[PDB]
Amino acid sequence: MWRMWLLFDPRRILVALGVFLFVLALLIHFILLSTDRFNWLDGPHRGAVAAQM
Amino acid sequence: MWRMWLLFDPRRILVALGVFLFVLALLIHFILLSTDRFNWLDGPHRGAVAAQMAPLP
Amino acid sequence: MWRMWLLFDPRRILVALGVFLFVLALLIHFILLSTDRFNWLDGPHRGAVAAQMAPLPA
Amino acid sequence: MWRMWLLFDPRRILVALGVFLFVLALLIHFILLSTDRFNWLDGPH
Amino acid sequence: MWRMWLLFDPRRILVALGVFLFVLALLIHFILLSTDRFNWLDGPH
Amino acid sequence: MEIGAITQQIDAAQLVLYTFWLFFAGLIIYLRMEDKREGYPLVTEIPGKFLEGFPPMPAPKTFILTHNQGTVTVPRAVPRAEIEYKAEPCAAWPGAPHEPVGPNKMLSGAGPSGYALRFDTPEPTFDTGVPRMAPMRVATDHVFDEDGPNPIGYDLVGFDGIVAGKITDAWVDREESLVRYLEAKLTNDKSILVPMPLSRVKDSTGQVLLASLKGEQVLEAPTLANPDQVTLREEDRIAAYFASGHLYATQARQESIL
Amino acid sequence: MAMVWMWILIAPAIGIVLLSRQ
Amino acid sequence: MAMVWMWILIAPAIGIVLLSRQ
Amino acid sequence: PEFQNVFTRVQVKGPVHMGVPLPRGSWARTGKPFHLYLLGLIGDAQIGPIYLGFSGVASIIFGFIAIEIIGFNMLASVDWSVPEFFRQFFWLALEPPAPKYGLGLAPLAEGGWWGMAGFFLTASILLWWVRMYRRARALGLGTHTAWAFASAIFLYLSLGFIRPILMGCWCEAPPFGIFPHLDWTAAFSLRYGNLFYNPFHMLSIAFLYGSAVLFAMHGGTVLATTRFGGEREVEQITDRGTAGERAMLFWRWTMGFNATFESIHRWGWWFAVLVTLTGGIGILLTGTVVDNWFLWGVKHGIAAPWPNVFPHVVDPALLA
Amino acid sequence: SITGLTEAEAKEFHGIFITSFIVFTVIAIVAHLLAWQWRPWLPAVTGYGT
Amino acid sequence: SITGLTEAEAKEFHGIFITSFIVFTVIAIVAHLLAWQWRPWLPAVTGYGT
Amino acid sequence: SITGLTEAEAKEFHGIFITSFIVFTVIAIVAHLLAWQWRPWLPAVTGYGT
Amino acid sequence: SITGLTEAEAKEFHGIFITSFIVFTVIAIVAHLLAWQWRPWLPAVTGYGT
Amino acid sequence: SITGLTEAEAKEFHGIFITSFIVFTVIAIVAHLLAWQWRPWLPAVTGYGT
Amino acid sequence: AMLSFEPKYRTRGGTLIGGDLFDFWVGPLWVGFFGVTAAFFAILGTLLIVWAAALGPTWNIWRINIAPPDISYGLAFAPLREGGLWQLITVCACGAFVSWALRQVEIARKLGMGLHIPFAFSFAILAYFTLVVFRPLLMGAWGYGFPYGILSHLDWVSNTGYQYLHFHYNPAHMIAISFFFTNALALALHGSLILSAANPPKGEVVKGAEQENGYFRDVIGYSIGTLGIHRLGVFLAVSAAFWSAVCIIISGPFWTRGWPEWWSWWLNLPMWSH
Ligand code: BCL
Ligand code: BCL
Ligand code: BCL
Ligand SMILES: CC[C@H]1c2cc3[nH]c4c(c3C)C(=O)[C@H](C(=O)OC)c4c3nc(cc4[nH]c(cc(n2)[C@@H]1C)c(C(C)=O)c4C)[C@@H](C)[C@@H]3CCC(=O)OC/C=C(/C)CCC[C@H](C)CCC[C@H](C)CCCC(C)C
Ligand SMILES: COC(C)(C)C/C=C/C(C)=C/C=C/C(C)=C/C=C/C(C)=C/C=C\C=C(C)\C=C\C=C(C)\C=C\C=C(/C)C(=O)CCC(C)(C)OC
Ligand SMILES: [Fe+3]
């Protein structure tokens, strides 16, 4: 499997991997903030929710 | 079927497959997240509103 | 890892890194300002907002 | 770090840094003017 | 600091500085005039 | 409360509108005068009667050209000489058309075969006085791009299917790096230039198709004064000859088709 | 509270002159 | 909480100066 | 049929053109230009190089901050939910300040971010105008591009800066969003009584339609005469060829009058410029000297007398 | 060599790349263990239920 | 000299530039002093309090 | 050497890059320690509870 | 020398750049000291509390 | 050879490709087994019930 | 009267119908068969407009309003005083526009030019045909056409737009506007660049392709070139008219609700649907 850096340019792969992983990490961190349960800054119960039966 | 690589360039196939597999997985993860049953973070979507109305003039 | 700089241009990396770090730091500071608890200027008590559906001040 | 001016144009660094600092300083002054506590002109409400 | 004029054209600096200083002064005057306290024409309301 | 009222009936927005109308009238006058820097004053069916129309012709302006090819003043006090076109009027009254003469109407200089007496020197590049259009055998720094057709060696075919010659070289624009002419070796050993905008490169059959001329009419196309450069006037001659074929190649192309 | 404005206005001006003599 | 802003403002400046003198 | 010159499949690779030498003191051009066959089909194949002087870099920094202010607030308006950001992206905006604050600086949550984004974006646009002006001078060209650009800036400033000042409220300015700024455009017409009856809106439309008419006519004229080298327009201007003569004769025989290869670009220049010049003036008039354009139209005798097919109705609020 | 590296360079890069991948993943595994302790995900169909 | 200035004229401009900068700042300083006398800024947290 | 860097001038850059990263990270670490003392994050599922 | 400056002049720019950076930072530090005196930031979770 | 890969390397790449595909699928199978344990899909016509 | 270079170009031929009978010039204008037809339709159509105005209540040029028939008449030819005159004027306009385009084809053939100009104009004709025949045909009534009046046809546009309660949300409307706005931006740029090259500062030499391509590479990093910009000018203007025709043909025959409601397909995509 080491015979892949002769097939793919390491400079292009590392730059693409760096952008992809940062965007992915931004996406996940952002989604958790939007949740009520996993928001680590303001915490739970930030808005008004109608009671359910 | 190893001959499939004598026909198609491996560099393009792996890049095309990698892009294809990520987009599909991203699509599937997002469809489940939008559901109430398969949302693994909060569960059902309650649709919280702002705490108070913006005051009238 | 000194050998990596023969493959990646230090000019390109430093410029891309500086822009990326500032935008990230700017984003994180903004996110904190967009919270009541971590707002370090006015504090945890959000001020009341004015009426949007209002006439021109005359 | 005196060698960082061998690979970076000092004219280009100063121009980018000069605009950046002024824009950032404008940004911070603007933010404070739009706060209740740190508005130094009309003061707090 | 006099060595900066070997790096930057004095003619370019003066015109850019003149425009920058005028717009900045125009911005500050406008901001003050739109406040209640520092409006020097009609005064406080 | 009537803000913007000048009188009981005239208001500010109305006055601003009439201000624009005055400006727009002046702008149209200015634009129409600028339109009259070429081809004016008009010629009539009188030896010495000229019309300038309204608005009148503008004051002259001068263009400075590169590489010491002179100064151009428009409108010209003395207009450029016209080519000696060969046509017979279809009637004597004004407004009647004329019919080009000669067995080869593309050489008559009438109708679409007419051309302007431009500069008799090659168009130069801005950086150097080097001719702008050059064959690729001279402009060796230009090569055909891959994944695109290479017309060198193709047959030159008229719209009647008759092969007139083979494509030998391409002429490129040294300023914009594009093909403007294909050079073809004709069966009479003539080496004419064909305009790229009038050539259909069919790389499937290895042919360059001419929809404007028959195969035999290609053999009478203009030739360059010297083989490595083309003047502005020659460019006009070549374009006029090929393009006039759409009206003059056959008698059918000149008559009403329905 | 005048001292706040005095430093932020005057001290940069002195800084330019002091950086200029060197 | 003065030290919260004093560190984040001054320490990078010291770091830059020390890194420059390297 | 004949070659229609829709796109160019036969292409040649020449040495990259870096441009004319720049005047002393200018920067070096940025980037290594390369040939692209895809763009060579419809236009020129070379991408780059680019010149990044003081105006260009300053404009980018100012503009990028403004874009960050918009994007961060848009993302905060969906509570940082990326799925909701993609779902609602067209609906999101950075809203202008509330009417309470007039021309003063609003709080951040109530229009303060809008004003800062408006300032930084305006600075970026003005700095770009300097770039368009100075790049033309560096090449020995006229500044026609910069002054045409100033016309577009005039409408932009009238919408967001001049008119809100004349009205005394930043709340009258458009928001920074895709669908919301369409809502603002429609709400503007609703508030001020059918902007169709604004005469400068009529003129701006006439020139907007006229720009489409002229460019279709002019582009078609040049394409129809590319067989005569008609696209080499400046050379046709200084030394008229058969392409210029046929182009002039086509329109003279069609409608009785014609332009020249130079003057047609003056017609096109003014028609595009007058779109935003008349548009800017019309926007400055509404609410300042005219409050209801249809009633203004009725006053000035341009309201067509449509029949009323319904029985007469009385405003029920009067009798209450 | 389509990329342009040598026989030795490709293997040396492979060792560095895998090691960096291991370190990055190991840190993320620790981070997910800490995150799970703070706030577990994957609720029951009826909710988390304290 | 990338700008294209000799030592003599570069020093001359620098001297004039500093003097103009000092004169401009001094006038501005007195302007701020008069402005502060007309209407002070930087209120206390409770407001200006007349 | 696609970059165009000698082995001597490339190892020196790696040395300068690493120490700048460490200095930058150490300052940020202390900043986060101060930030935690001012206002801790990561609340309980109930809330911060003052 | 991709930039086009000699070793000697790079050192001189570095000395001027760092000195200007220190002067600018020190003035900013005093400004923040005065700003903190006028109006402190970073309140407690219960607010500034006058 | 349109691809240009020789016979020896093409069979080697296929062996790597098939082995990677098997490992990727096997992990996905266990992932779906765990997902089915946490929350089944494919409900009855009347719903999942409970 | 003729331009200085004109006389050599006035050849016989290029006509599609008629031949030498109508192949002559009146002043600067060439006539041909379709020039006769265009003149006939234009004059008759204009005269009918004036007669319809004479039947109306005003001679004010801005307030003249010639309206189509009632919807109840369907696709029938209405009486002249109740929309029949509008139908006749519409037929004259259709004949005049097609004859004008066909006349341009003959003129271009006489000069040995391409047919790009009549091709571009045909898209303007398509938009008009969409407004007055194609859309009314799909709705089944000629009453859907816009009235002929300088200010009255703006009232039709306004009321038609609010039959969908927010016409900005029409998706083909957005595309068409994007083409109109870009075309004006492209026209301003192209006119500026040619004038800047042909009219440099006084005493300076005229500039060519090197500065023209160099200018936009410096400011934006790419130049489309002289051939590309004229291709772009046609493409933008033609597509603005084409998508304008699309935006109105789908308003009522293929969409009867508010246009913002149409965007619920995007809001309800399963990746983020509520
Ligand atoms: C919600 C509960 C926790 C939390 C839960 C988690 C969990 C779980 C994880 C993280 C992880 C991370 N968290 Mg956390 N995190 C929280 C809140 C935060 C906050 C904040 C302001 O509150 C910040 C700043 C962070 C920051 C971080 C990062 C340190 C880290 C993501 C690494 C990454 O993106 O690599 C992207 C960048 C790269 C991979 C560099 C690429 C290098 C390339 C290959 C080499 C060439 C470079 C090339 C030339 C240039 C391009 C690359 C550029 C970077 C663009 N978290 C809260 C408090 N966090 C992840 C982690 O620990 O990863 C180790 C992780 O698994
Ligand atoms: C229901 C809505 C109303 C209506 C309300 C308005 C309002 C309000 C306005 C118009 C305006 C116009 N209307 Mg209208 N209009 C109506 C119906 C029409 C109809 C029709 C057939 O129904 C047409 C064809 C038009 C056409 C027009 C144009 C002639 C004119 C816009 C000129 C322009 O190009 O601006 C587009 C160009 C600009 C806005 C300038 C842009 C230049 C700047 C520099 C851009 C910088 C970009 C920056 C660098 C990038 C930032 C990106 C960041 C992420 C933010 N309207 C109806 C009646 N209309 C405008 C006008 O001028 O009226 C007099 C205007 O303000
Ligand atoms: C509280 C509000 C007070 C007030 C408090 C203050 C205070 C405090 C100050 C001012 C200052 C100014 N005020 Mg005040 N001011 C008020 C009301 C006014 C009114 C009015 C109609 O009411 C006017 C006309 C002014 C006018 C002025 C200016 C004289 C001055 C700003 C100088 C400047 O912009 O330099 C910018 C332009 C340059 C520096 C150009 C210099 C030449 C260049 C560098 C050389 C080459 C030029 C090159 C060709 C480029 C040219 C570009 C163009 C100049 C644009 N004030 C009210 C009453 N005012 C400032 C001052 O006095 O500074 C001297 C100042 O500190
Ligand atoms: C005559 C009127 C018409 C017109 C004309 C016109 N427009 C023009 C011009 C002209 C003549 C120009 O010369 C100018 C131009 O440059 O054209 C190519 C322009 C222009 N008209 C434009 C748009 C435009 N024009 C429009 C309309 C019109 N323009 C009218 C129809 C519209 C509409 C219809 O709404 C739009 C949207 C631009 C393409 C351009 C002006 C560009 C500009 O101002 O650029 C600066 C603005 C910014 C927001 C800066 C961008 C910053 C980058 C996005 C940053 C990227 C990241 C960054 C590098 C990271 C690092 C940053 C660090 C700080 C960290
Ligand atoms: C990593 O970052 C990313 C995530 C990539 C960022 C992403 C950013 C995104 C997605 C941004 C999207 C933006 C979008 C879609 C924007 C759309 C905007 C649109 C359509 C705008 C339309 C019209 C807007 C107009 C005309 C606005 C004009 C405003 C003006 C002229 C304001 C001028 C006032 C000036 C000059 C001031 O001095 C006043 C300043 C002050 C006094 C402080 O406040 C009062
Ligand atoms: Fe053109």
Short mmCIF file of C-alpha atoms in Angstrom, two decimals, chain E residues 2-5 8 15 18-19 25 28-30 34 37-38 41-42 44:
data_model
loop_
_atom_site.label_atom_id
_atom_site.label_comp_id
_atom_site.label_asym_id
_atom_site.label_seq_id
_atom_site.Cartn_x
_atom_site.Cartn_y
_atom_site.Cartn_z
CA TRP E 2 13.76 57.57 6.90
CA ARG E 3 14.69 54.41 5.00
CA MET E 4 10.98 53.78 4.36
CA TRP E 5 11.04 56.41 1.60
CA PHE E 8 7.71 53.48 -0.82
CA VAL E 15 -2.16 60.96 -1.84
CA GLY E 18 -4.60 62.44 2.29
CA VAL E 19 -7.57 60.36 1.15
CA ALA E 25 -12.24 62.62 9.55
CA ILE E 28 -15.76 60.65 12.79
CA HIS E 29 -17.66 63.88 12.13
CA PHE E 30 -20.64 61.91 10.81
CA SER E 34 -25.58 61.34 14.55
CA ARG E 37 -24.72 64.32 22.95
CA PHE E 38 -22.17 65.49 20.37
CA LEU E 41 -25.88 71.80 15.04
CA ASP E 42 -29.33 71.06 16.48
CA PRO E 44 -29.55 67.38 22.27
#
